[PDB]
């Protein structure tokens, strides 16, 4: 097919969302008392999801700045 | 679905794309071009665009898209509220009325060009065309329509200009500046027939037909 | 309950029960009679590993306190009730040196498990500051 | 809303941890009273009950809210959690079934898990605030 | 390789350098200058710069770049996805197709000037020109091409202006302002010829020939 | 009222007010960008 | 990408499991015939970095259910009750393992904070 | 010497002072002023300001400065690699080629102004001038040079406008807007001459001769 | 005296009040206003404000205030370094040259207005004016002087504009835009006079008359 | 009372509310609006807002409020300092002067609106209006007074525009851009009439009448 | 009648101040030698007062942040 | 400037020197004929403040001993404890001044 | 650059090695004929600062071929003991305390330098 900016961006945002969801489910099960999951697993995955969130936010800010700079030049 | 992450990214970014992409996606292009062209006739601006013309076009496009916004509301804002429809069928259900609205105004050979230069293969039906091809085709078609409407609006004021200049020069007025004479005649034509209501109604009718 | 807290807490419970049994022995050494009238039989605890299904290791459980069935050293007081034919009172068989050593070792093991718990608690509370 | 539906679980869990906390400190405070019968609650089952049902705290009534100067007073209130008896080891001649080691290891565990819940809520709320700036 | 430091450092800087250098390095310069010059003709602006012509130019450049970006994708994004390529060979693997594209449009002599003012030695082939030489040469060639298209666009409306003026003088229109007379005729000429379709198509077909 | 309840309420309200203000900022910016074009 | 944090992460996780093992040794330092167990960190970590089963997982309401090498610690000073936990050895090992867990925590903290610093 | 404190404290602040002082102490003033004045000729912008003219200027001035930056590299960066030089003699070692360049570009009497108004003592030679007097002298002389170039740029398009207006006037065209006809001819004169290459190259040549 | 308590607490806040208050207390009001007005003449901005004019004004103000800065240096700093002066005697020692410098430039009637609307009692001499009176009075006088210079600078370019317009439409070139013809002549006039030296020298020498 | 308990928490938040409320509740809105409008006239801004107009407005509002600040100080700070007043009667002791000042400045019809919409009953005297009513009425009245002043300030400069445009049209200077010619005349209009002193004096006089 | 949440903030500040003043006067009375008052009671009340004061400080910080944010919407 | 820490810095240095002297006293508490020494902290501090960068006076003895040794251990213990406490005080005072100077600053 | 941190770092590292050496003494406080060792800190540190910390990696070809200094002086003893052991405890005790304190000092100095650079940067 083609690079599919819309489809690619959608897939990336889905990756962010499902990493957050996996971290949240793990923390849910840990605080509910379900055996297995270790504490360091919970903290490490939560921080990984937070870093993914921050990377997405920074990408968004840069792209929004680019779009608003391009759509302001007088033609 | 998305998880307190991306939701409120895609929303705030969509609000960022609002003024340019979403406003020139629907209307307010034809209306604004026609209003500016009407301002070229009748002489000078005399209508403060930063203050009045843009807001008038904004109100007119709100009126124009009342049906599509109503159908969007019915298809999404009822179901998507709290139950059974979550941002995947909501997206296509809410895309359908706007997409039908745009496809109903697009010249049937704009889409041809933009498919033939996007290297898109066969497009099975009218619904098969993607927004990627639908956006520039709709913009080009709307520019054509705006220029047609502006030309028709220019017709009578051009007629008044030429008839007034002809009267002045035939009655012997060798070298009078017929423009200053014609401008109040332009106003008289435009107000006696109640011109603004005719214009907004004709635009509104022709916009969906 | 996190697994390691459970292991060390079970150790604490087992050590407390072992020390209690040792104290009861050391206290009722030289006790002629029980309630109904019978020797005080010297008591011991049974330590077994916990978490039987899964990993075969972890924690200590002191289920099933038992009795030390040594032959219950006798004395001779043939005017005392509780003396059978061949007047022979039954006189609990508690060895004081063994019980004192049991108390010392139980206290030390208790301390070791307490102080493992403190170490682990610090370890986990530090884990909570992972990154931030 | 949809802000207090995603943060609801950790909020409820952390409040339940605080409630179990004063239950355990009531165990500790009554260490040497006679016939106390140490209490405790099951955290997982109670958390599921809270999520499905709500709070529905049982027993509590405040006075009315008439014109000012009417001396507010309140009745004795208690959370709807059903206190469970802790199965005792080592009978102790005075009914007090509060074992320092059990109660204290549970106290430390509950403290640590309360701190974990605070960390999780802090992370989620910082994430929300990082989106919106 | 790089270790998720400078990766995700050079990524964000690349994003920041995107809007200016990348857009004025690929296309959308020729398109936007040609749109501006078409706006010069036909009378007033009468098409909003900051929204609609910018959006249409972005869409045109996306469609034109789709083959280039697809080559870049197949040569980096799959092979940069975790295996044998990590943002060192990704850079040059992605640059090569874009470099070939830009070379295909550069004037044969702009490269010469910028090479001669770099004191660069002799060059063997088109693969020997570096990005340092290749940016400004492409920019200057693009400006020339844009101005040539500007001529081809001004020609017919200049014809209309002059023919209207000549008719008005011969008829004896002493000093009628022929500009107001010619503006609706310019719009008429540009709508019957179907000018928006055929203009964007002409730019596209020009741009890679 | 529970203390943790009070701080969770604090933060929830703070986030909600932040989100409302940011949404209004986006809408006001869009309005002004629409009103600052040429006609 | 972002599995570049994997190594230390899993390493840290393994250390934690080791603690339990070592902790058990301290808990059962008095039980008869315990035969103190332990695992070798380096080989176990290498194996896990190189690398239960899935049940009936169609739509919900079918109750999903989830399903290391514990090596002998060769003893010294036999003790007639089978217990081979030389508590001195286990104390030293526990101190060292706790320390290396702290080191792993610091290393993940540093990698994560470097990542976050680049991202702002 | 300095100790990885104040070193790397002077570095970051130097990068802070970069965008203004360093881009307006070397070049890019004459070039950008000539580009802006050229853009005033030929009518409308016809080149996006913040993007194409600015970027092209940045490239061009990098290309002029490449010899001075080469000498600054040889006399600062290579020796500043741990040995015999650390930001004390390195300062004037890296200044001297740049000072030589600026003196070679300054007016021989702007130095006089900014020296006499500083109460500075009599100067023995070019080397005795300080950076203090050198900066404003270079800026003022560069503004003079830029305006001379701009005047020469405005010459030929002035010629085209006058000839077009005169032809229209002789033909009797009382009220035709000669700018509208003359603009495509302005671009004409600017492309057949191959104006962008000539102008870029002539700026580069004028800048060192 | 102060004890590394309030000292270095008033130093840092002094630096935060620097950019506005101190730079608008001395000069760089008159210089910036005059340059801005000069730039309204001579056509478009055509000079990078936040880049060259601001830096040139900074250098110019350094040079103009240099006697004041030297007097403050000698009378305040070195005596403040270690011996007999600590940040209260230092204040008047460092103010006296500055107060004299601002008095010499104030309109002899702004002080009257601000002293009378501050309920100030009779003033014995030039030294009795408080800083509270002397700041805003100096600001108002400076604004008046800057606008005076501004008109006096506008004059010759007004001459060029009007003569070009008269010649053009007298010759019969009824409606060629005189600004476009004039702009090269404005630049020519301002470069043959060597306008930048005359301007900056006159500003500097005016600023101590 | 409070015991270095919540005190110094309320004090620091009071300092937080200082800049916005206490400079938008006393003065400095009227003056700053008048300055902004004055800059709208006289052509281009050319007065550094962030520094000079802001500073002049701040000094002028301080000079205006010296009596009000003195009364608030004498009746609050001296008593609030250590004896018989502490943050309980301090508020009303410091509010009465500010209330009297605000009431002396309010347009008499704004209070009517805000009492009629706050559902408050009839108000017997001047004092009966509370803060909840006094603030919006004061800001509305300040806006009204500021714009009355500002538009009266425009009127003469638009007179200058009128006369210059009409003279240029009378001479037939077809399309000479009258704004450029008007700007220097607006400047001497504003300096010969002794503009800045008269304006500051009129504002100060009007601000207590 | 009305809540007038500035009145609610005033009530909160009055509560905090009164609690601290009560703890201070209890320490006063105890160190003065007044019989009755116990040491553990003094320390417990001082602890509670400290917690309430940090309550007030945190509310201060977040209110100031909220106000500094509502003054950033462009109008 | 930045000689506002000079007084406590020189005081702390003299305190360290006195610690060394008293440790030498304790060490030689048994060597025959030692004649225990000390320094006068106040006078030496004033002397180092007036001029900058210390005579070893003799601690006046009590209780003779026939080995000539005059280290009377009780006095030395009290003085060593006093000097250690004063050194810790000087540490706290310098720390407070540096804390203040770096608090005002950032 | 960034070799300012080298000196202290080397010192720190060398201190650690000395601890090991010293620890060996304590661990061998009674083994017969031990002959306690020690190293001269100043000379070894200066030697490391002059030159550095000999080995060669395996063949520099492609992978799948799986490619891959402190002279111990002797402590002069006192008090012989007829088991050869010359670890006089007291000296080792004070040396261990001194080495630990100076290792801490090295940590503090290195941390201060790293904090200095980080404060300048941010």
Tab-separated table of N, CA, C and O in Angstrom, chain G residues 15-72:
chain	number	residue	atom	x	y	z
G	15	UNK	N	16.498	-10.639	40.685
G	15	UNK	CA	17.029	-10.419	42.025
G	15	UNK	C	15.929	-10.535	43.060
G	15	UNK	O	16.100	-11.197	44.088
G	16	UNK	N	14.769	-9.941	42.778
G	16	UNK	CA	13.677	-9.980	43.737
G	16	UNK	C	13.279	-11.412	44.036
G	16	UNK	O	13.147	-11.799	45.202
G	17	UNK	N	13.135	-12.233	42.995
G	17	UNK	CA	12.810	-13.631	43.238
G	17	UNK	C	13.883	-14.275	44.095
G	17	UNK	O	13.574	-14.980	45.062
G	18	UNK	N	15.148	-13.989	43.790
G	18	UNK	CA	16.234	-14.529	44.594
G	18	UNK	C	16.032	-14.204	46.062
G	18	UNK	O	16.207	-15.069	46.924
G	19	UNK	N	15.616	-12.973	46.358
G	19	UNK	CA	15.400	-12.597	47.747
G	19	UNK	C	14.484	-13.597	48.423
G	19	UNK	O	14.835	-14.166	49.462
G	20	UNK	N	13.335	-13.883	47.803
G	20	UNK	CA	12.407	-14.842	48.388
G	20	UNK	C	13.124	-16.133	48.722
G	20	UNK	O	13.093	-16.597	49.866
G	21	UNK	N	13.853	-16.677	47.750
G	21	UNK	CA	14.603	-17.904	47.982
G	21	UNK	C	15.501	-17.732	49.194
G	21	UNK	O	15.374	-18.449	50.193
G	22	UNK	N	16.355	-16.710	49.166
G	22	UNK	CA	17.244	-16.479	50.297
G	22	UNK	C	16.445	-16.235	51.564
G	22	UNK	O	16.789	-16.757	52.628
G	23	UNK	N	15.351	-15.480	51.461
G	23	UNK	CA	14.537	-15.227	52.640
G	23	UNK	C	14.026	-16.528	53.222
G	23	UNK	O	14.069	-16.729	54.440
G	24	UNK	N	13.589	-17.449	52.363
G	24	UNK	CA	13.127	-18.736	52.857
G	24	UNK	C	14.228	-19.433	53.633
G	24	UNK	O	13.981	-19.994	54.706
G	25	UNK	N	15.461	-19.357	53.135
G	25	UNK	CA	16.566	-19.987	53.840
G	25	UNK	C	16.682	-19.450	55.255
G	25	UNK	O	16.938	-20.209	56.194
G	26	UNK	N	16.485	-18.145	55.436
G	26	UNK	CA	16.573	-17.587	56.777
G	26	UNK	C	15.383	-18.029	57.610
G	26	UNK	O	15.511	-18.284	58.811
G	27	UNK	N	14.205	-18.125	56.994
G	27	UNK	CA	13.023	-18.505	57.755
G	27	UNK	C	13.141	-19.927	58.270
G	27	UNK	O	12.782	-20.212	59.416
G	28	UNK	N	13.658	-20.828	57.441
G	28	UNK	CA	13.815	-22.233	57.787
G	28	UNK	C	15.215	-22.552	58.281
G	28	UNK	O	15.706	-23.663	58.074
G	29	UNK	N	15.878	-21.598	58.925
G	29	UNK	CA	17.223	-21.847	59.416
G	29	UNK	C	17.241	-22.792	60.601
G	29	UNK	O	18.324	-23.199	61.031
G	30	UNK	N	16.077	-23.139	61.141
G	30	UNK	CA	15.982	-24.045	62.269
G	30	UNK	C	15.252	-25.340	61.963
G	30	UNK	O	15.388	-26.291	62.736
G	31	UNK	N	14.488	-25.410	60.874
G	31	UNK	CA	13.723	-26.608	60.577
G	31	UNK	C	14.657	-27.768	60.239
G	31	UNK	O	15.754	-27.561	59.716
G	32	UNK	N	14.264	-28.996	60.564
G	32	UNK	CA	15.124	-30.143	60.271
G	32	UNK	C	15.037	-30.569	58.818
G	32	UNK	O	13.954	-30.698	58.248
G	33	UNK	N	16.202	-30.810	58.226
G	33	UNK	CA	16.289	-31.292	56.864
G	33	UNK	C	15.780	-30.343	55.801
G	33	UNK	O	15.036	-30.760	54.914
G	34	UNK	N	16.167	-29.069	55.865
G	34	UNK	CA	15.657	-28.130	54.876
G	34	UNK	C	16.434	-28.185	53.567
G	34	UNK	O	15.836	-28.054	52.493
G	35	UNK	N	17.752	-28.372	53.622
G	35	UNK	CA	18.580	-28.437	52.419
G	35	UNK	C	18.493	-27.130	51.626
G	35	UNK	O	17.890	-27.061	50.559
G	36	UNK	N	19.072	-26.084	52.218
G	36	UNK	CA	19.050	-24.724	51.680
G	36	UNK	C	19.227	-24.682	50.170
G	36	UNK	O	20.152	-25.282	49.624
G	37	UNK	N	18.347	-23.941	49.507
G	37	UNK	CA	18.350	-23.793	48.061
G	37	UNK	C	18.772	-22.386	47.652
G	37	UNK	O	18.707	-21.437	48.433
G	38	UNK	N	19.210	-22.274	46.402
G	38	UNK	CA	19.630	-21.008	45.818
G	38	UNK	C	19.683	-21.182	44.309
G	38	UNK	O	19.619	-22.298	43.796
G	39	UNK	N	19.797	-20.061	43.599
G	39	UNK	CA	19.965	-20.072	42.153
G	39	UNK	C	21.193	-19.250	41.800
G	39	UNK	O	21.589	-18.339	42.530
G	40	UNK	N	21.802	-19.582	40.669
G	40	UNK	CA	22.962	-18.853	40.178
G	40	UNK	C	22.490	-17.722	39.279
G	40	UNK	O	21.840	-17.962	38.260
G	41	UNK	N	22.825	-16.493	39.659
G	41	UNK	CA	22.240	-15.336	38.998
G	41	UNK	C	22.657	-15.246	37.540
G	41	UNK	O	21.816	-15.038	36.665
G	42	UNK	N	23.949	-15.384	37.258
G	42	UNK	CA	24.442	-15.061	35.924
G	42	UNK	C	23.812	-15.956	34.865
G	42	UNK	O	23.262	-15.467	33.872
G	43	UNK	N	23.880	-17.272	35.063
G	43	UNK	CA	23.346	-18.193	34.068
G	43	UNK	C	21.834	-18.064	33.949
G	43	UNK	O	21.287	-18.110	32.841
G	44	UNK	N	21.145	-17.905	35.078
G	44	UNK	CA	19.695	-17.767	35.043
G	44	UNK	C	19.282	-16.514	34.283
G	44	UNK	O	18.338	-16.541	33.486
G	45	UNK	N	19.988	-15.407	34.512
G	45	UNK	CA	19.710	-14.168	33.797
G	45	UNK	C	19.985	-14.302	32.306
G	45	UNK	O	19.206	-13.817	31.478
G	46	UNK	N	21.097	-14.937	31.942
G	46	UNK	CA	21.372	-15.127	30.523
G	46	UNK	C	20.272	-15.946	29.865
G	46	UNK	O	19.763	-15.582	28.795
G	47	UNK	N	19.860	-17.032	30.514
G	47	UNK	CA	18.811	-17.869	29.948
G	47	UNK	C	17.510	-17.095	29.801
G	47	UNK	O	16.840	-17.197	28.771
G	48	UNK	N	17.136	-16.308	30.812
G	48	UNK	CA	15.851	-15.624	30.720
G	48	UNK	C	15.906	-14.526	29.669
G	48	UNK	O	14.897	-14.232	29.019
G	49	UNK	N	17.067	-13.902	29.467
G	49	UNK	CA	17.119	-12.864	28.448
G	49	UNK	C	17.126	-13.454	27.048
G	49	UNK	O	16.633	-12.816	26.113
G	50	UNK	N	17.674	-14.657	26.875
G	50	UNK	CA	17.579	-15.317	25.574
G	50	UNK	C	16.122	-15.601	25.229
G	50	UNK	O	15.671	-15.360	24.104
G	51	UNK	N	15.364	-16.110	26.191
G	51	UNK	CA	13.957	-16.419	25.969
G	51	UNK	C	13.106	-15.156	25.976
G	51	UNK	O	12.953	-14.504	27.009
G	52	UNK	N	1.149	-20.106	32.225
G	52	UNK	CA	1.999	-20.798	31.275
G	52	UNK	C	1.470	-20.758	29.855
G	52	UNK	O	1.647	-19.771	29.142
G	53	UNK	N	0.817	-21.845	29.441
G	53	UNK	CA	0.263	-21.901	28.096
G	53	UNK	C	-1.091	-21.200	28.055
G	53	UNK	O	-1.726	-20.934	29.083
G	54	UNK	N	-1.536	-20.899	26.838
G	54	UNK	CA	-2.794	-20.193	26.635
G	54	UNK	C	-3.958	-21.176	26.617
G	54	UNK	O	-3.934	-22.171	25.886
G	55	UNK	N	-4.976	-20.895	27.427
G	55	UNK	CA	-6.172	-21.726	27.474
G	55	UNK	C	-7.196	-21.322	26.425
G	55	UNK	O	-6.881	-20.597	25.476
G	56	UNK	N	-8.419	-21.821	26.579
G	56	UNK	CA	-9.523	-21.441	25.709
G	56	UNK	C	-9.784	-19.942	25.858
G	56	UNK	O	-10.394	-19.504	26.839
G	57	UNK	N	-9.331	-19.150	24.882
G	57	UNK	CA	-9.430	-17.694	24.960
G	57	UNK	C	-10.251	-17.076	23.834
G	57	UNK	O	-9.814	-16.107	23.206
G	58	UNK	N	-11.435	-17.617	23.575
G	58	UNK	CA	-12.432	-16.921	22.775
G	58	UNK	C	-13.074	-15.870	23.688
G	58	UNK	O	-12.490	-15.469	24.699
G	59	UNK	N	-14.260	-15.378	23.340
G	59	UNK	CA	-14.870	-14.293	24.094
G	59	UNK	C	-15.002	-14.661	25.569
G	59	UNK	O	-14.921	-15.826	25.961
G	60	UNK	N	-15.215	-13.634	26.387
G	60	UNK	CA	-15.113	-13.765	27.831
G	60	UNK	C	-16.164	-14.730	28.371
G	60	UNK	O	-17.026	-15.231	27.646
G	61	UNK	N	-16.077	-14.965	29.680
G	61	UNK	CA	-16.885	-15.926	30.425
G	61	UNK	C	-16.450	-17.369	30.187
G	61	UNK	O	-17.286	-18.280	30.218
G	62	UNK	N	-15.152	-17.599	29.958
G	62	UNK	CA	-14.602	-18.952	29.996
G	62	UNK	C	-13.439	-19.098	30.974
G	62	UNK	O	-12.649	-20.038	30.838
G	63	UNK	N	-13.323	-18.207	31.957
G	63	UNK	CA	-12.468	-18.402	33.130
G	63	UNK	C	-11.027	-18.699	32.725
G	63	UNK	O	-10.605	-19.864	32.742
G	64	UNK	N	-10.255	-17.705	32.293
G	64	UNK	CA	-8.841	-17.953	31.991
G	64	UNK	C	-8.080	-18.355	33.242
G	64	UNK	O	-8.354	-17.863	34.336
G	65	UNK	N	-7.109	-19.250	33.068
G	65	UNK	CA	-6.312	-19.749	34.182
G	65	UNK	C	-4.853	-19.872	33.772
G	65	UNK	O	-4.530	-20.572	32.809
G	66	UNK	N	-3.980	-19.205	34.517
G	66	UNK	CA	-2.549	-19.259	34.279
G	66	UNK	C	-1.946	-20.508	34.917
G	66	UNK	O	-2.422	-21.013	35.935
G	67	UNK	N	-0.877	-21.001	34.302
G	67	UNK	CA	-0.185	-22.180	34.805
G	67	UNK	C	1.028	-21.778	35.637
G	67	UNK	O	1.338	-20.594	35.768
G	68	UNK	N	12.868	-21.327	36.429
G	68	UNK	CA	14.079	-21.178	37.226
G	68	UNK	C	14.518	-22.548	37.720
G	68	UNK	O	13.711	-23.468	37.801
G	69	UNK	N	15.801	-22.689	38.044
G	69	UNK	CA	16.346	-23.934	38.572
G	69	UNK	C	16.838	-23.736	40.004
G	69	UNK	O	17.809	-23.019	40.250
G	70	UNK	N	16.150	-24.358	40.952
G	70	UNK	CA	16.517	-24.272	42.361
G	70	UNK	C	17.617	-25.286	42.631
G	70	UNK	O	17.357	-26.481	42.768
G	71	UNK	N	18.851	-24.814	42.716
G	71	UNK	CA	19.989	-25.691	42.914
G	71	UNK	C	20.281	-25.859	44.393
G	71	UNK	O	20.087	-24.940	45.188
G	72	UNK	N	20.744	-27.050	44.759
G	72	UNK	CA	21.254	-27.264	46.103
G	72	UNK	C	22.321	-26.227	46.417
G	72	UNK	O	23.065	-25.795	45.536
